[PDB]
Amino acid sequence: QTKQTALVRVENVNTREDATWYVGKRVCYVYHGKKVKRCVRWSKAPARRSTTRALWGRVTRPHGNAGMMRVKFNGASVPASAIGRRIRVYLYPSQI
Amino acid sequence: VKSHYICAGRLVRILRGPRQDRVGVIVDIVDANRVLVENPEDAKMWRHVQNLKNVEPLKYCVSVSRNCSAKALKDALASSKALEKYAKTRTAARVEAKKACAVSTDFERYQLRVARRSRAHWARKVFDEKDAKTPVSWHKVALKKMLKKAAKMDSTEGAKRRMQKAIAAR
Amino acid sequence: AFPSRKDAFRAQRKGAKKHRPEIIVIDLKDHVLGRAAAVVAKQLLLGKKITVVRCEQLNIAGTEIRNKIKYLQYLRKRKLTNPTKGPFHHRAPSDVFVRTVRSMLPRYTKRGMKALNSLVAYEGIPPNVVRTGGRVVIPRAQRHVCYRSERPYTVLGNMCKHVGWKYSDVVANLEKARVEKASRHHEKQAKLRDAWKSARKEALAKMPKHNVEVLKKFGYA
Amino acid sequence: VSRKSPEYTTLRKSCAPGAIAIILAGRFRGRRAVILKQLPHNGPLVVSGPMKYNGVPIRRIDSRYVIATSTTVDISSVDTAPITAEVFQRPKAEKPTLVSDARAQLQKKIDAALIAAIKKDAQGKEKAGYLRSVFTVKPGDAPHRWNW
Amino acid sequence: VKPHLRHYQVVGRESPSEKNPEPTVYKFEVFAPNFVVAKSRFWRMMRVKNKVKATHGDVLSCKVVKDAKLVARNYLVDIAYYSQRCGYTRMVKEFRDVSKTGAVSQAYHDLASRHRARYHNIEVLNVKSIPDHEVKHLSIAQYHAPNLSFPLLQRRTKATRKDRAIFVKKNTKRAVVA
RNA sequence: UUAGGGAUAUGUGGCGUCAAAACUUAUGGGCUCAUUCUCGAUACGUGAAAAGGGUGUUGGUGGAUAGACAGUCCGAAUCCACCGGCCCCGAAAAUGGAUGACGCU
RNA sequence: GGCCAGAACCAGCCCUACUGCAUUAUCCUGUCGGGGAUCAAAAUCCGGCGGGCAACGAAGUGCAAGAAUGGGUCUUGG
RNA sequence: AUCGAAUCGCCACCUACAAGACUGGAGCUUGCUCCCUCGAAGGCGCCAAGUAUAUUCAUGAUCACAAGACA
Ligand SMILES: [K+]
Ligand SMILES: [Mg+2]
Ligand SMILES: [Mg+2]
Ligand SMILES: [Mg+2]
Ligand SMILES: [Mg+2]
Ligand SMILES: [Mg+2]
Ligand SMILES: [Mg+2]
Ligand SMILES: [Mg+2]
Ligand SMILES: [Mg+2]
Ligand code: NA
């Protein structure tokens, strides 16, 4: 395997055209740590302080013919502890 | 019995492909696998070869000979009124509704959601009226079955005294 | 399985309601063993929680004698110097399905065993799964779309009962009781279903008209 | 005309003034607002989506975090000239339910004009209810296959 | 599906020389996936019948003979194939098809399936559209019945590729994983 | 055929799961049923099989006979020889075991 | 701020959409004859003669050079 | 009670059954004709308890785990 690219299967995305529609969309992997670490708006929104963390990526290209997508995360690769776990594929950036 | 046989003049619907959900007439049977399909009144349904796995036979069969001319097939289709009768059926309406939902905008989806919620609300109101009239729901069946026993149990003088005192204290 | 007193005390302290994870219940009746196993293994590797019922009604292509002989050939495989710790030949149909899926999984990694522990297999439909929601099928692994109907096929329960499975009759009696109970409960609630259908019919007239036309446009009224 | 000029813009035509837009991110994700104008220098869009209807105030939002639907409101009667980057500029801060009067009056006037425009429209009430609606992704939804 | 072989007419001759100032021009019809294979078969036939190599010849034209209008027809394909065990085996087979190219492609598939013959071991001697009353095999003549009717039994109908689902409710069209 | 790294395409080989790819593609045609080394899917790798045989099935080539063959007359095709494809018999060894596994019709 | 993100634009590069030119005849189409089958027919098929562009997105036939004057670049620099 | 978490569709209308060489129901002519509920939707849910006359949302200042979740 080459871990710098990840494969994401999205519900109801079962064709290469759908995965093409998703090319460029932001991708988030949400998990939690053991301690409460720094976050965006740590001072502005103290209600966001949590053990919950997120790793962000983007859809680079479709993979195969059945709606699978290739995702690259910002810098570091996504951990293998995320294999089989939930991935958030947002609708932005919007081209429509 | 039942089903609809593959024969000359049989109306069919295209299952998959770029002609999906279009209707043509079997004008000639090539072999076990393929037929010749044509349909006037439809621009894309010129005489072409279809695989029988891709057709859906319909309940209509215009009377026509194998390998019929365009004029003869068109006259037979017009006289039989097969397309009209098909357009009156619920499956054709479902196909049209699927096309409309495919082409729908966000505002049309909002309007559909509003209409479905309104029908749901009025169905709930009608159901509540009929359910109070006759106990068909779980809660109304439980209500009557326990209400008889409760009326029997609260007719006691001690029950009424305790009930009245505790209500007055409230 | 039985929760700890610590877990129950914590649930009471948190006060959260009953929680059930998202679980797909598959009715494996009249399903091809290998194809259903492949689909279920892929879905388990994708992180889904799957419970399969009526594993005694799975199908294998070929006559029952050929598949009995295949199973007996499997049963011949044992560690000669110590049959304990040798291959363990499970005779129950649900165990057979679990073994097939396990063979279609990376069973010697943490990921594969995580996938395998996400699968629960039953013979018949036990009471804890009867009322948990509508059961699913696998269209691409169903017998009426996979086998040419001329050819013979094996029902997994019939093979298992002759290769050593002991609970064929118990499962049959339980399924008879379950279907009798479910048929009784479905003959009842018929008044409720008819009442709801008539309620929707009358709502079609009691609702504002442009909504009715919108429903007619989208094939709903 | 020139990339140095404020009037320059590369915004897609769908995000036109008066178009109703689904807000994709931020505090008002899922809410439907009305695009009022675009700020100069190819800047962010400004949406109102009357705060009476869906609670969204006059607010900047990048066009990449909005889905501009094909439904539009003729908002030519709305005076979007007072909306300028100055009213969104914040004072510099020193070392360490609240709306300034100018912002509140701008929102009140803009919302009055926008409600007048929406109400004066064929399907005006349906569009008001549409703006009150909340957009969410349901289980089984395929937004990639939809028109907007 | 459209046939994988096209009907080519290759016209060629030996290159004019002093010894043979005006060589005979030969018209050759072949069924090939592309025109390069058509020229290859033409030059093989020229070599094996006229002792004319491609290195001493001209190809005047290599055109596709268009199909007629698609009509259910009986096609007689006279075809031969080679095997080491039997040598050259010639057979005449009738096919139902709508075109000569379709009939010949069907014949090639039939030879590949029933006799394990490959394209380059096969020579199509002739393909002709024949009337119904000249059809001898009942497996073809059964399609000449005026009231030819049959149902579609044991259908394996798959959903539209977008609509396909992995898990669906048992007596319902609601997709649970799709 | 090879400096340390990205991106995009391929080669050989593959796209049911293991395992990336047809979430088991086609709106492609035919053939095959194989009961205890369990049909087959083994280029090199012979790293397993033959002579011979089969009224299993599916093709071909010649010859014929047509109120024909069979049946006891009576209504339509029948018979003979030969050659292919796949399958089967031929086909017996020693720890439990290998189309890589599961399975697949 | 020599940190983390989003968007905008510029140059380069990488993908995609947008198509013309030749060809067709063993072809298309009327009519007469044959032949076929029918319940009668038409058709499948063969000749003669008379016209031709099968032009709907005509063909899955040969060649195409159509200035993205739409995406990606956390695959490059600003 | 540490404990901040990842998970994001509910249902006492699916949560009964069986068959795909097969009808919702008939007919005789057995593959066509005629009836019906016309044989391609499990019901809700997606911001007014319902389709209209409403009604607080900002400064959480342009994306950041939804800053919240008993539907
Ligand atoms: K004639
Ligand atoms: Mg080497
Ligand atoms: Mg895979
Ligand atoms: Mg090997
Ligand atoms: Mg070998
Ligand atoms: Mg032999
Ligand atoms: Mg094996
Ligand atoms: Mg292998
Ligand atoms: Mg959160
Ligand atoms: Na079937």
Short mmCIF file of C-alpha atoms in Angstrom, two decimals, chain E residues 40-106:
data_model
loop_
_atom_site.label_atom_id
_atom_site.label_comp_id
_atom_site.label_asym_id
_atom_site.label_seq_id
_atom_site.Cartn_x
_atom_site.Cartn_y
_atom_site.Cartn_z
CA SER E 40 -3.12 -8.93 -44.22
CA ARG E 41 -5.74 -11.52 -45.19
CA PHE E 42 -5.79 -10.18 -48.75
CA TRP E 43 -2.03 -10.54 -49.11
CA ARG E 44 -2.12 -13.99 -47.54
CA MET E 45 -4.72 -15.04 -50.11
CA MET E 46 -2.70 -13.45 -52.92
CA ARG E 47 0.39 -15.33 -51.73
CA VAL E 48 -1.38 -18.69 -51.43
CA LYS E 49 -3.34 -18.48 -54.70
CA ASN E 50 -1.41 -16.23 -57.12
CA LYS E 51 2.18 -16.36 -55.76
CA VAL E 52 2.06 -12.58 -55.33
CA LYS E 53 3.82 -11.24 -52.24
CA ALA E 54 2.86 -7.97 -50.59
CA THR E 55 6.39 -6.73 -51.32
CA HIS E 56 5.61 -6.90 -55.07
CA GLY E 57 1.98 -5.77 -55.07
CA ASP E 58 -0.40 -2.84 -54.87
CA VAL E 59 -3.59 -2.32 -52.89
CA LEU E 60 -5.89 -0.22 -55.05
CA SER E 61 -8.68 0.09 -52.48
CA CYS E 62 -9.60 -1.22 -49.02
CA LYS E 63 -13.17 -0.10 -48.38
CA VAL E 64 -15.92 -1.24 -46.04
CA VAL E 65 -18.98 -2.69 -47.75
CA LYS E 66 -21.86 -1.14 -45.82
CA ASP E 67 -24.58 -3.30 -44.35
CA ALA E 68 -28.08 -3.26 -45.77
CA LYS E 69 -31.04 -2.12 -43.69
CA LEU E 70 -31.46 -4.30 -40.61
CA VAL E 71 -34.03 -7.00 -41.43
CA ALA E 72 -34.50 -10.40 -39.80
CA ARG E 73 -32.91 -12.71 -42.36
CA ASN E 74 -31.55 -16.21 -42.86
CA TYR E 75 -27.84 -16.12 -43.66
CA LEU E 76 -25.96 -19.06 -45.16
CA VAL E 77 -22.28 -18.90 -44.16
CA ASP E 78 -20.00 -21.34 -45.97
CA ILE E 79 -16.99 -21.47 -43.67
CA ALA E 80 -13.88 -23.58 -43.13
CA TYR E 81 -11.38 -23.96 -40.33
CA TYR E 82 -8.12 -25.79 -39.76
CA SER E 83 -7.09 -28.10 -36.94
CA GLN E 84 -3.97 -30.22 -36.61
CA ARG E 85 -6.06 -33.30 -35.85
CA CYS E 86 -8.48 -32.99 -38.79
CA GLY E 87 -6.90 -30.62 -41.28
CA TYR E 88 -9.31 -28.36 -43.14
CA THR E 89 -12.97 -28.82 -42.21
CA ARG E 90 -15.56 -27.06 -44.37
CA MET E 91 -19.10 -26.55 -43.11
CA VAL E 92 -22.21 -24.68 -44.24
CA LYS E 93 -24.20 -23.14 -41.40
CA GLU E 94 -27.39 -21.10 -41.33
CA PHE E 95 -27.83 -18.19 -38.92
CA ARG E 96 -30.57 -15.76 -38.01
CA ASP E 97 -29.25 -12.19 -38.05
CA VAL E 98 -29.90 -8.70 -39.43
CA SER E 99 -26.66 -8.20 -41.39
CA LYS E 100 -23.90 -10.08 -43.17
CA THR E 101 -21.30 -8.76 -40.72
CA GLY E 102 -23.46 -9.84 -37.78
CA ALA E 103 -23.99 -13.27 -39.32
CA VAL E 104 -20.26 -13.75 -39.91
CA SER E 105 -19.36 -12.53 -36.41
CA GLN E 106 -21.91 -14.98 -35.02
#
